[model samples]
Target: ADLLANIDLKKADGTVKKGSDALANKKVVALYFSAHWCPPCRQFTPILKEFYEEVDDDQFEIVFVSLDHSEEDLNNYVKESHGDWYHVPFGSSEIEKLKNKYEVAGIPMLIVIKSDGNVITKNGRADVSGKAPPQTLSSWLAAA
Candidate 1:
């Protein structure tokens, strides 16, 4: 897929390396743009975690793309509230690449992409706020 090729992503604990094994068979990936200094981002991160727990499906996953000022902030934020998800490494060029690809300019932004690289929604934040897990998962499955 167009998106997964350079993902080379990592988890909060740094267990899984760059490859398909990191994907864990998740067909839908949610890219969460956030920063520790942003109040709105801090508020929403936990909600996103809740959504992840309720769904907890192999078809879905989230990769946090931090906008923090430093690695400390990124590490702290992920340690405190994020789900068991992947993230762009601190200072990785992939961060800018994703922002440009999605035209990102805000915190707490969530982009949903199918395994084949087709985006299901660029406004997944709205989807999480408005729909329950079943409805939300349905939307993603239907999109795929």
Candidate 2:
């Protein structure tokens, strides 16, 4: 169960939120690796926010793992564009661990995983940025 780790997250405003509580019972969790400095990441973040708002909460969750250079960059990025979602606090070692575990090579790559840690898709950026709501989530859910 430690595959996801017990890392706490911070809201856009930097308030502490318990990681366990946020992740509890989520069937398909996404580790969205992104950075504010990346222009493509900037374009996709809002679309992802919209898609996240419409997804069935009983199944999906996202833990945004920031690749931005500093805490302030993360805060500003999320505060301005991202959904009200969970993100590993900037600079935590959990960031590097999750990145390596998923073999994330590009910014805005959303790695969809089962709660048990099986990878559903390493190409969520395509699924998400290409399709709409249920169709997008449906593709991943079907694979899972």
Candidate 3:
């Protein structure tokens, strides 16, 4: 179930974090599937960023999975619209693996999952948009 343990996560600053380290003590892990080219993704990214900043809890973390055409676009998108978060590095096989694992058929999908890779909810976008950070995260923790 520790599907992410073997993968490497990258920060915007060029540092790498082992997925295990990133997920450590994180009760809720949100796999954010998005791209700069997608209008809906751009709209939702800021909302998720606000939620992330407001939540400010060590129990939660978000891992962005970019669907951009190139690494430049991915980095630019993160710099322009995202919260401080880890992400599957561009051009890594992990991206496709994660997409398949979560059945990510569309951009702007936020799949909240446990450390063990069990999903908490696939409707994380709606949850963040409709509820306060505390309430949304509380619900995720309850389910996790």
Candidate 4:
């Protein structure tokens, strides 16, 4: 379930890269699907940001897949609101592929993926907000 095993993403600094380049061994990846125009997305972003800041970067990373209308909008949103994370380039072919692959029905969907690209949990917001037991997430990521 190593998420980085098959996925590569672009950094905010304009570098095209893979998750292995950013995350440490045994790390978890949070695939964050969202857009700036959505109110719920806006509200959830800060909360996610706080959680992102709380988690050590060596154990976790976030890959933002923006649903904005244009690259400019996407970049602006990332610059203004998102945390220190990688993102798929705005308007790339990969975006559509990921949307279909994940069957994303709406904005602000966060999926926690293992180091091997398998999903630990498709619904990770519950963990982020402390609704689920912390050990549940810990064990899920720590499991072989």
Lowest-scoring 10 consecutive residues by lDDT in candidate 3?
129-138
What are the root-mean-square deviations of the candidates from the true structure over C-alphas?
6.9, 6.4, 6.8, 7.3
Query: Per-residue lDDT tens digits of candidate 1, residues 37-106?
Result: 9887788788899999998798887889899989998988999999989888899888898888888886
For residue 32, model 2's alpha carbon misses the true position, in angstroms, by 0.5
Between candidates 1 and 3, which one is better according to lDDT? 3
Every model's TM-score: 0.84, 0.83, 0.88, 0.79
- Candidate 3 lDDT over 22-117, as tens digits, reads 778888899999999998888889999999999899999899999999999999999999999998989999999988988887677899998888
Backbone collision tally, model 3: 0
Worst 10 residues of 4 by lDDT: 128-137
Candidate 4 structure, TM-score to reference: 0.79
Candidates' C-alpha lDDT: 0.81, 0.81, 0.87, 0.77
lDDT of 4 by residue, 1-144 (tens): 444544567766777765556665646788889898887788788889898888756677888888999889898888888888889887677778777877886777888887676788987867776543444668889995
Among the numbered candidates, top TM-score falls to 3
Q: Which is better, 1 or 2, measured by TM-score?
A: 1
Residue 67 miss distance in model 3 (angstroms): 0.6
